[PDB]
Design an enzyme around this catalytic site. Structure first.
Site, PDB file in Angstrom:
ATOM      1  N   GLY A 155      -2.165  13.720   3.707  1.00  0.00           N
ATOM      2  CA  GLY A 155      -1.572  12.443   3.359  1.00  0.00           C
ATOM      3  C   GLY A 155      -2.043  12.051   1.972  1.00  0.00           C
ATOM      4  N   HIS A 185       2.719  10.316   7.294  1.00  0.00           N
ATOM      5  CA  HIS A 185       3.073   8.924   7.528  1.00  0.00           C
ATOM      6  C   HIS A 185       3.013   8.046   6.283  1.00  0.00           C
ATOM      7  CE1 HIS A 185       4.118   5.566   9.980  1.00  0.00           C
ATOM      8  NE2 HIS A 185       3.040   4.890   9.623  1.00  0.00           N
ATOM      9  N   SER A 186       2.216   8.454   5.300  1.00  0.00           N
ATOM     10  CA  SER A 186       2.093   7.707   4.053  1.00  0.00           C
ATOM     11  C   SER A 186       3.461   7.502   3.406  1.00  0.00           C
ATOM     12  CB  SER A 186       1.185   8.456   3.065  1.00  0.00           C
ATOM     13  OG  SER A 186      -0.190   8.317   3.391  1.00  0.00           O
ATOM     14  N   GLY A 231       4.382  -1.862  -0.232  1.00  0.00           N
ATOM     15  CA  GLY A 231       3.808  -1.701  -1.555  1.00  0.00           C
ATOM     16  C   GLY A 231       2.305  -1.503  -1.560  1.00  0.00           C
ATOM     17  N   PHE A 271       3.517 -10.046  -1.151  1.00  0.00           N
ATOM     18  CA  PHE A 271       3.305  -9.253   0.053  1.00  0.00           C
ATOM     19  C   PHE A 271       1.846  -9.351   0.475  1.00  0.00           C
ATOM     20  CE2 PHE A 271       2.667  -5.293   2.439  1.00  0.00           C
ATOM     21  CZ  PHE A 271       3.754  -5.357   3.298  1.00  0.00           C
ATOM     22  N   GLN A 295      -4.669  -3.251  14.203  1.00  0.00           N
ATOM     23  CA  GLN A 295      -3.772  -4.260  13.665  1.00  0.00           C
ATOM     24  C   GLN A 295      -2.341  -4.035  14.116  1.00  0.00           C
ATOM     25  OE1 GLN A 295      -2.875  -4.825   9.304  1.00  0.00           O
ATOM     26  NE2 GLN A 295      -4.387  -6.474   9.567  1.00  0.00           N
ATOM     27  N   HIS A 346       1.922  -5.303  13.893  1.00  0.00           N
ATOM     28  CA  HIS A 346       2.924  -5.795  12.965  1.00  0.00           C
ATOM     29  C   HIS A 346       3.819  -6.680  13.829  1.00  0.00           C
ATOM     30  CE1 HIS A 346       5.425  -5.283   9.224  1.00  0.00           C
ATOM     31  NE2 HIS A 346       6.270  -5.896  10.032  1.00  0.00           N
ATOM     32  N   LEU A 406      10.276   0.204  11.430  1.00  0.00           N
ATOM     33  CA  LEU A 406       9.997  -0.978  10.649  1.00  0.00           C
ATOM     34  C   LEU A 406      11.190  -1.584   9.930  1.00  0.00           C
ATOM     35  CD1 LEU A 406       7.414  -2.347  10.786  1.00  0.00           C
ATOM     36  CD2 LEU A 406       6.731  -1.353   8.595  1.00  0.00           C
ATOM     37  N   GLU A 463      12.465  -6.754   7.051  1.00  0.00           N
ATOM     38  CA  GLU A 463      13.204  -8.010   6.959  1.00  0.00           C
ATOM     39  C   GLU A 463      12.277  -9.197   6.725  1.00  0.00           C
ATOM     40  OE1 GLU A 463      16.178  -8.620  10.223  1.00  0.00           O
ATOM     41  OE2 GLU A 463      16.327  -6.435  10.120  1.00  0.00           O
ATOM     42  N   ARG A 508       0.888 -13.184   9.064  1.00  0.00           N
ATOM     43  CA  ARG A 508       1.447 -12.238  10.029  1.00  0.00           C
ATOM     44  C   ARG A 508       0.574 -12.155  11.267  1.00  0.00           C
ATOM     45  NH1 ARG A 508       4.370  -6.978   7.110  1.00  0.00           N
ATOM     46  NH2 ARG A 508       6.156  -8.161   6.284  1.00  0.00           N
ATOM     47  N   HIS A 547       0.195  -1.019  14.479  1.00  0.00           N
ATOM     48  CA  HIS A 547       0.597  -0.644  13.143  1.00  0.00           C
ATOM     49  C   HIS A 547      -0.445   0.093  12.304  1.00  0.00           C
ATOM     50  CE1 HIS A 547       2.995  -0.779   9.569  1.00  0.00           C
ATOM     51  NE2 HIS A 547       2.155  -1.571   8.926  1.00  0.00           N
ATOM     52  N   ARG A 570      -7.047  -5.727   8.117  1.00  0.00           N
ATOM     53  CA  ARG A 570      -6.623  -5.136   6.864  1.00  0.00           C
ATOM     54  C   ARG A 570      -5.660  -6.084   6.144  1.00  0.00           C
ATOM     55  NH1 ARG A 570      -1.240  -2.392   5.949  1.00  0.00           N
ATOM     56  NH2 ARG A 570      -0.977  -4.301   7.196  1.00  0.00           N
ATOM     57  N   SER A 629      -3.993  -0.845   2.542  1.00  0.00           N
ATOM     58  CA  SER A 629      -4.192   0.457   3.170  1.00  0.00           C
ATOM     59  C   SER A 629      -3.638   1.663   2.433  1.00  0.00           C
ATOM     60  CB  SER A 629      -3.665   0.442   4.611  1.00  0.00           C
ATOM     61  OG  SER A 629      -2.505  -0.352   4.750  1.00  0.00           O
TER      62      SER A 629
HETATM   63  C1  LIG Z   1       3.071   3.459   9.789  1.00  0.00           C
HETATM   64  C2  LIG Z   1       3.238   2.641   8.536  1.00  0.00           C
HETATM   65  C3  LIG Z   1       2.103   2.375   7.771  1.00  0.00           C
HETATM   66  C4  LIG Z   1       2.194   1.606   6.580  1.00  0.00           C
HETATM   67  C5  LIG Z   1       3.450   1.088   6.132  1.00  0.00           C
HETATM   68  C6  LIG Z   1       4.624   1.366   6.921  1.00  0.00           C
HETATM   69  C7  LIG Z   1       4.537   2.120   8.096  1.00  0.00           C
HETATM   70  C8  LIG Z   1       5.766   2.410   8.917  1.00  0.00           C
HETATM   71  N1  LIG Z   1       3.582   0.342   4.976  1.00  0.00           N
HETATM   72  C9  LIG Z   1       2.476   0.090   4.240  1.00  0.00           C
HETATM   73  C10 LIG Z   1       2.592  -0.688   3.015  1.00  0.00           C
HETATM   74  O1  LIG Z   1       3.645  -1.111   2.601  1.00  0.00           O
HETATM   75  N2  LIG Z   1       1.430  -0.933   2.307  1.00  0.00           N
HETATM   76  C11 LIG Z   1       0.165  -0.441   2.758  1.00  0.00           C
HETATM   77  O2  LIG Z   1      -0.771  -0.716   2.086  1.00  0.00           O
HETATM   78  N3  LIG Z   1       0.040   0.292   3.873  1.00  0.00           N
HETATM   79  C12 LIG Z   1       1.136   0.572   4.635  1.00  0.00           C
HETATM   80  N4  LIG Z   1       1.036   1.322   5.765  1.00  0.00           N
HETATM   81  C13 LIG Z   1      -0.193   1.958   6.299  1.00  0.00           C
HETATM   82  C14 LIG Z   1      -0.445   3.130   5.269  1.00  0.00           C
HETATM   83  O3  LIG Z   1       0.789   3.779   4.934  1.00  0.00           O
HETATM   84  C15 LIG Z   1      -1.464   4.124   5.807  1.00  0.00           C
HETATM   85  O4  LIG Z   1      -2.698   3.542   6.176  1.00  0.00           O
HETATM   86  C16 LIG Z   1      -1.690   5.271   4.769  1.00  0.00           C
HETATM   87  O5  LIG Z   1      -0.469   5.893   4.280  1.00  0.00           O
HETATM   88  C17 LIG Z   1      -2.618   6.292   5.442  1.00  0.00           C
HETATM   89  O6  LIG Z   1      -2.836   7.563   4.499  1.00  0.00           O
HETATM   90  P1  LIG Z   1      -3.664   8.726   5.014  1.00  0.00           P
HETATM   91  O7  LIG Z   1      -3.792   9.668   3.786  1.00  0.00           O
HETATM   92  O8  LIG Z   1      -4.903   8.285   5.507  1.00  0.00           O
HETATM   93  O9  LIG Z   1      -2.984   9.381   6.184  1.00  0.00           O
HETATM   94  P2  LIG Z   1      -1.497   9.901   6.563  1.00  0.00           P
HETATM   95  O10 LIG Z   1      -0.619   9.683   5.548  1.00  0.00           O
HETATM   96  O11 LIG Z   1      -1.175   9.410   7.930  1.00  0.00           O
HETATM   97  O12 LIG Z   1      -1.652  11.411   6.784  1.00  0.00           O
HETATM   98  C18 LIG Z   1      -2.514  12.014   7.802  1.00  0.00           C
HETATM   99  C19 LIG Z   1      -2.443  13.538   7.561  1.00  0.00           C
HETATM  100  O13 LIG Z   1      -3.340  14.163   8.532  1.00  0.00           O
HETATM  101  C20 LIG Z   1      -2.681  15.371   9.037  1.00  0.00           C
HETATM  102  N5  LIG Z   1      -3.409  15.599  10.286  1.00  0.00           N
HETATM  103  C21 LIG Z   1      -3.649  14.688  11.299  1.00  0.00           C
HETATM  104  N6  LIG Z   1      -4.360  15.206  12.294  1.00  0.00           N
HETATM  105  C22 LIG Z   1      -4.594  16.504  11.925  1.00  0.00           C
HETATM  106  C23 LIG Z   1      -5.327  17.605  12.589  1.00  0.00           C
HETATM  107  N7  LIG Z   1      -5.928  17.499  13.745  1.00  0.00           N
HETATM  108  N8  LIG Z   1      -5.341  18.794  11.887  1.00  0.00           N
HETATM  109  C24 LIG Z   1      -4.730  18.951  10.675  1.00  0.00           C
HETATM  110  N9  LIG Z   1      -4.047  18.001   9.998  1.00  0.00           N
HETATM  111  C25 LIG Z   1      -4.007  16.794  10.662  1.00  0.00           C
HETATM  112  C26 LIG Z   1      -1.259  14.979   9.115  1.00  0.00           C
HETATM  113  O14 LIG Z   1      -0.397  16.091   9.200  1.00  0.00           O
HETATM  114  C27 LIG Z   1      -1.080  14.257   7.769  1.00  0.00           C
HETATM  115  O15 LIG Z   1      -0.668  15.061   6.709  1.00  0.00           O
HETATM  116  O1  LIG Z   2       5.815  -4.962   6.464  1.00  0.00           O
HETATM  117  C1  LIG Z   2       5.876  -3.816   5.966  1.00  0.00           C
HETATM  118  O2  LIG Z   2       6.971  -3.244   5.651  1.00  0.00           O
HETATM  119  C2  LIG Z   2       4.598  -2.998   5.685  1.00  0.00           C
HETATM  120  C3  LIG Z   2       3.317  -3.484   5.970  1.00  0.00           C
HETATM  121  C4  LIG Z   2       2.067  -2.678   5.678  1.00  0.00           C
HETATM  122  O3  LIG Z   2       1.531  -2.803   4.531  1.00  0.00           O
HETATM  123  O4  LIG Z   2       1.407  -2.240   6.602  1.00  0.00           O
END
Ligand SMILES: *Cc1cc2c(cc1C)nc1c(=O)[nH]c(=O)nc-1n2C[C@H](O)[C@H](O)[C@H](O)COP(=O)(O)OP(=O)(O)OC[C@H]1O[C@@H](n2cnc3c(N)ncnc32)[C@H](O)[C@@H]1O
Ligand SMILES: O=C(O)/C=C/C(=O)O
Ligand SMILES: *Cc1cc2c(cc1C)nc1c(=O)[nH]c(=O)nc-1n2C[C@H](O)[C@H](O)[C@H](O)COP(=O)(O)OP(=O)(O)OC[C@H]1O[C@@H](n2cnc3c(N)ncnc32)[C@H](O)[C@@H]1O
Ligand SMILES: O=C(O)/C=C/C(=O)O
Ligand SMILES: [Ca+2]
Ligand SMILES: [Ca+2]
Lengths: 655, 655
Positions: free
Chosen positions: B14, B43-44, B50, B141, B255, B257, B267, B270, B301, B369, B404, B409
């Site tokens: 990620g 998921h990132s 933003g 935001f 946390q 949403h 998500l 809106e 929120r 969330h 958070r 995040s």
């Molecule tokens: C779910 C979500 C979160 C979110 C958001 C909207 C949604 C739908 N909008 C956000 C926003 O506007 N502003 C913000 O600040 N945060 C927002 N978030 C949360 C945020 O996106 C997350 O906290 C952030 O992207 C997390 O990044 P991170 O680098 O930590 O992790 P990741 O992207 O989830 O990737 C995890 C990776 O790990 C690999 N993985 C997992 N388990 C394993 C194992 N066991 N072995 C090997 N690889 C593994 C996954 O494949 C992945 O690549």
């Molecule tokens: O409300 C959203 O679209 C994203 C929120 C987040 O930063 O976790």
């Protein structure tokens, strides 16, 4: 840092290395084979004489067995070999041939009928019965009374190598070519792998493994005249030596071939398939009968080489821009019958010598051919450096002593690959290693720095003239005939040559695909190997096997019934450290006596040899009276070890 | 055995994992990134709100700086965060945005002119001067007074992730997808790598490295309703827990949403871009003004989620086959002007909800969330298990405490990737490891045996119904509102669920590409993670941030101004071991007080908070009198560390 791991690391892609890789890979041990070149181009592919194994199939092989092969091997070695290792060898050779047959090696087969010639005198017709039809044939090679040299027409080494390489591919062995081992990683007396240089990219990589096996071949290229491929430079021997712990055995024991083409060194198997080749001097005179009235040209190859040198020093040699040589005349034949394959040698002479054998004579001169010496191991193939094994010509397992039997070396490569392979696999499966990154980084960065210093060196020496000067010195002073005065001078010049090799400078500065950089680090290694041979030759004041001291013409079983062990403890010393490992006469199945070739009564008898001899004679007569078989008598005389897989007896025609 | 070595092992592809890989790879450390899926699908990539960073570019960002961002973060965390880590974060966020800009991330930019709306009341026209033109823009935001959320139109997470992944490719980082870390290799309190299962071939492989970093994301999928991708199952958290040494922090801090689409969890951003979305109940009644007369729908929120649950428990929710929910009405808009991009949400509703927002209302319900909790590290990102680092949502670096800040995040993922990346690189370059094959083989064969037992299990439990039962329990008892009685029961059922997971049986027996085998080993891991959350929630008798105990409605700064540390020492225990790490009030730049959202005076004051508060007030007034700047006052209140690379100040418009 770049690191590759495997359970079993094999350095060398020849017959020995590939066969050992099969042994480890077949038991689930992940294995990597490292090689300078694609494995199917290894020097093993040049073998055209054949492989020695007591099958007992053909008429001229009738009655052959382990004992007879064992005797020829020991006497040939002039009692310098480890007789127990020789027993392991002769007993396993038959099954190596048969395993290769099952792997598709197209061994020439026997067919019912009669054949002519192929004999010194008297008899001239051979009859192969019907029950022998279809079995693996054999030819006369190596001078053994019993014909036991198996062959696949005129390309035995080639078909054998291809089959073993194909088996490696089948098993998924990881074959990595154009990769060179330039140093061994070790700590606390244990070997954990090798630092490798990628010849293409120039990357320095650490290959770590629970066990490492060196099967890098001979070091014939330290000589100017050799039959060996351009890659047989002894670097595998050197990196072992540079650990300061692994030891080299009988490096002075070098074997020459009497008839390679001059000056190329290309082998003319003339006078082999069908005796007829006649050696002539500058006057066209057939000289062999003058020195050997009875055996003539058919004398022991060991003897033929000496006589050829003697005749040349008598001023009867042919002068040429490349030095003196003699003549090989086969035109005396140039025809026969058919019923089988018999046409090759002419092409060699036409393609290189640029001439038809059936017309003109071929220029020849004895040249370096085989390396009895190599990395010293125990009967299992393990060196003093724990976890480091060696097999093939690169080793001094020592079944050869001071004179290899013709046909026994390609045989040892596969046989040792099988046996050492088993012990190597066992070691890799049972041992547990401590891989410290601190140690890995030291060896890796040490070689990277070394490569950088070579490229940045502002030295003025030319690596090529230093390498050529070395080869001349070896040829002139460490050949068929040696004497203290000249050996003294060669050792001195080699040492001086070694010091100058460190002041080399090269034009091409790149780190990748650099032929010039390659020579800059390989030459110093070759010089250390040369020094071991030369110094070993100087200190060995006796004549034994292929080692001939004109100032000490006799074989001294009192002070020299031993093996020379060379090491290089201090990375700063300029001469090898020599020690000796004595051969226990009591642990011998055959006490020292006449080797069977050369002058009679030319050895200082050892009182213990007579003592042991009587004991042997007694132990045999008794057990033989009790109706005990050769297997029980052998075990009573000298028991030896064999891994479970190969301790079975060898079935023969008419048991 | 199959072994892969690298200097720096990153588990997770990620934003955090990839950014950390850039840090190590750029300094010559060979690095491998392991990921379940191609890294650009992490998921990132779903982030649309933003990233928070105090640039101070736009009119509504005017006067923003590290202090203001720091305050919002701390108060938002409801004093549960490590304030020093928060300082490292806010100070580094500006440079993360700028580095990404240099890497091509197409941040939306500011243009000269006026804009309308986007305000609660009073003002409604915004003017961006000419000197602001062309700079990175920001939006409202996260509820911060100062608008500091940067974005690339409607796909911020996506463009950010792609840029960091592309940089990894540029540097030659080794990206290995469809590879899963199922266990960590450790000995004597040190981490030497991970045992990995190739999802395609089924091979079990040991990846050894001098340092290992876990950036595996959140564990939202232990809940039935979540916004998280299908792969956010917390296995990275679990393998850390299963070492019996690494600890998990504040797992109960989850946390939610307020407005994800029901029941998909997709998500609906809106009411974000342009406030207008109105929440309605079963009668079409706009209920938010009833609970929050002033803030109404624009309340925190955190508050909106609670009110939505309250309103539903009041029996005013909408019934459906999947449970109860509420309505989100944005039709109240369905039109405007132009001059920029503003059209997306409709598609989400049409493609999934199957309806046009400008007409019908969208069904919504609060859902899991974000995961504040994660692997506990020091400020450098290193866990109690030496050589094991963690960054991103998978960690509890703890800049979030119990809540958070919206936009913080995705910002932490990159920022932590930069900072922890530096410390991780430093560790990998300076440490020296002892890699014992005995230890490697134990972990590797241990997992192979484990895989074999799962495939051979004759158990009768169904892995899928056990996983679904777990998700229901988590949703029903460990949601927005919690109480001892229900937590007690959930913990009991989870533990029972965990014991049954070990009696699972599967139909597909193959070891390769087996979805069913995957669930068989992942579910037990998820259950251990769930137990940490549930039990942590039960033992924490107070209400803090997103953790709400109806039986302990107040924030207890006397007995609970600490952090929950979970571990699993005995591989046979069925409940986690919980310990607590107290937060030193003296090491705080901002003493505990009103968080700024929710009911007033709802916290048990700690005598030390008052003591420290006075000291802070004093220390500031004095230094401020001496004409000292905010940088000197901050350092006097609470000094913090930053690696050399990022200790520079952040230039802002009009310094
Ligand atoms: C779910 C979500 C979160 C979110 C958001 C909207 C949604 C739908 N909008 C956000 C926003 O506007 N502003 C913000 O600040 N945060 C927002 N978030 C949360 C945020 O996106 C997350 O906290 C952030 O992207 C997390 O990044 P991170 O680098 O930590 O992790 P990741 O992207 O989830 O990737 C995890 C990776 O790990 C690999 N993985 C997992 N388990 C394993 C194992 N066991 N072995 C090997 N690889 C593994 C996954 O494949 C992945 O690549
Ligand atoms: O409300 C959203 O679209 C994203 C929120 C987040 O930063 O976790
Ligand atoms: C030269 C020769 C030898 C020979 C023969 C004919 C010729 C022209 N005919 C024979 C015959 O008829 N019967 C017989 O019994 N022996 C005969 N011989 C000698 C025999 O062929 C050899 O002793 C035998 O083939 C040796 O096998 P071995 O497996 O030991 O070695 P190899 O084939 O030479 O291969 C060496 C491999 O090592 C690799 N290498 C070398 N150094 C390095 C380093 N530093 N790093 C990595 N790899 C290395 C080479 O690339 C090669 O693959
Ligand atoms: O004379 C040859 O062709 C080969 C001899 C060898 O076995 O070394
Ligand atoms: Ca040898
Ligand atoms: Ca977290």
């Amino acid at each position: 840092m770049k690191v590759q791991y495997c359970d079993s690391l094999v350095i060398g892609g020849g017959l020995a290395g590939l066969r050992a890789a099969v042994a480890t890979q077949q038991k689930g041990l992940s294995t990597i084979v490292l090689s300078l070149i694609p494995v199917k181009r290894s020097h093993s592919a040049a073998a055209q004489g054949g492989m020695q194994a007591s099958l007992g199939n053909s008429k001229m092989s009738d009655g052959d067995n382990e004992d007879l092969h064992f005797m020829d091997t020991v006497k040939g070695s002039d009692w310098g070999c480890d007789q127990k290792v020789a027993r392991m060898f002769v007993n396993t050779a038959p099954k190596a041939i048969r395993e290769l047959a099952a792997w598709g090696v197209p061994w020439t087969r026997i067919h019912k009928g009669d054949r002519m010639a192929i004999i010194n005198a008297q008899k001239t017709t051979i009859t192969e019965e019907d029950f022998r039809h279809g079995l693996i044939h054999s030819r006369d090679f190596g001078g053994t009374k019993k014909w036991r040299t198996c062959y696949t027409a005129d390309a035995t080494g080639h078909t054998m190598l291809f089959a073993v390489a194909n088996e490696c591919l089948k098993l998924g062995v990881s074959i990595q070519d154009r990769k060179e081992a330039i140093a061994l990683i070790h700590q606390d007396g244990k070997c954990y792998g090798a630092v490798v240089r990628d010849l293409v990219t120039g990357d320095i990589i650490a290959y770590v493994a629970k066990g490492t096996l060196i099967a890098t071949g001979g070091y014939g290229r330290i000589y100017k005249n050799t039959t060996n491929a351009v890659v047989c430079e002894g670097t595998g021997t050197a990196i072992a030596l540079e650990t300061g712990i692994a030891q080299l055995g009988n490096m002075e024991a070098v074997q020459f071939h009497p008839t390679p083409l001059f000056p190329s060194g290309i082998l003319l198997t003339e006078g082999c398939r069908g005796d007829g080749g006649i050696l002539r001097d500058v006057d066209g005179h057939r000289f062999m009968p003058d020195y050997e009235p009875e055996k003539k040209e058919l004398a022991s190859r060991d003897v033929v080489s000496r006589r050829m040198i003697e005749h040349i020093r008598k001023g009867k040699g042919v002068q040429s821009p490349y030095g003196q040589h003699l003549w090989l005349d086969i035109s005396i034949l140039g025809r026969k019958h058919i019923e089988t394959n018999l046409r090759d040698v002419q092409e060699i002479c036409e393609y290189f010598a640029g001439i038809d054998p059936a017309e003109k004579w071929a220029p020849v001169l004895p040249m370096q051919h085989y390396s009895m010496g190599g990395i010293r191991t125990d009967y299992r193939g393990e060196a003093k450096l724990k976890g480091l094994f060696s097999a093939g010509e690169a080793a001094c397992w020592d079944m050869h002593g001071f004179n290899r039997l013709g046909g026994n070396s390609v045989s040892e490569a596969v046989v040792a690959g099988m046996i050492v392979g088993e012990y190597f696999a066992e070691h890799c499966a049972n041992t547990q290693v401590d891989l410290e990154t601190k140690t890995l980084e030291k060896f890796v960065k040490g070689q990277e720095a070394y490569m950088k210093s070579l490229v940045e060196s502002k030295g003025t020496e030319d690596v090529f003239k230093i390498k050529n000067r070395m080869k001349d010195v070896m040829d002139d002073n460490v050949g068929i005939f040696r004497d203290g005065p000249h050996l003294e001078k060669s050792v001195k010049e080699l040492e001086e040559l070694y010091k100058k090799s460190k002041n080399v400078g090269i034009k091409n500065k790149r780190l990748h695909a650099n032929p010039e950089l390659e020579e800059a680090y390989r030459v110093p290694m070759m010089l250390k190997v040369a020094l071991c041979v030369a110094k070993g030759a100087l200190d060995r004041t006796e004549s034994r096997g292929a080692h001939n001291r004109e100032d000490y013409p006799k074989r001294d079983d009192i002070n020299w019934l031993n093996r020379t062990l060379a090491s290089w403890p201090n990375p700063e010393q300029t001469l090898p450290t020599l020690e000796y490992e004595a051969l226990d006469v009591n642990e011998m199945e055959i006490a020292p006596r006449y080797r069977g070739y050369g002058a009679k009564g030319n050895y200082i008898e050892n009182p213990l040899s007579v003592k042991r001899q009587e004991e042997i004679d007694k132990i045999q007569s008794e057990l033989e009276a009790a109706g005990k078989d050769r297997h029980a008598i052998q075990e009573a005389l000298m028991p030896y070890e064999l891994p479970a897989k190969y301790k079975a007896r060898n079935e023969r025609l008419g048991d």
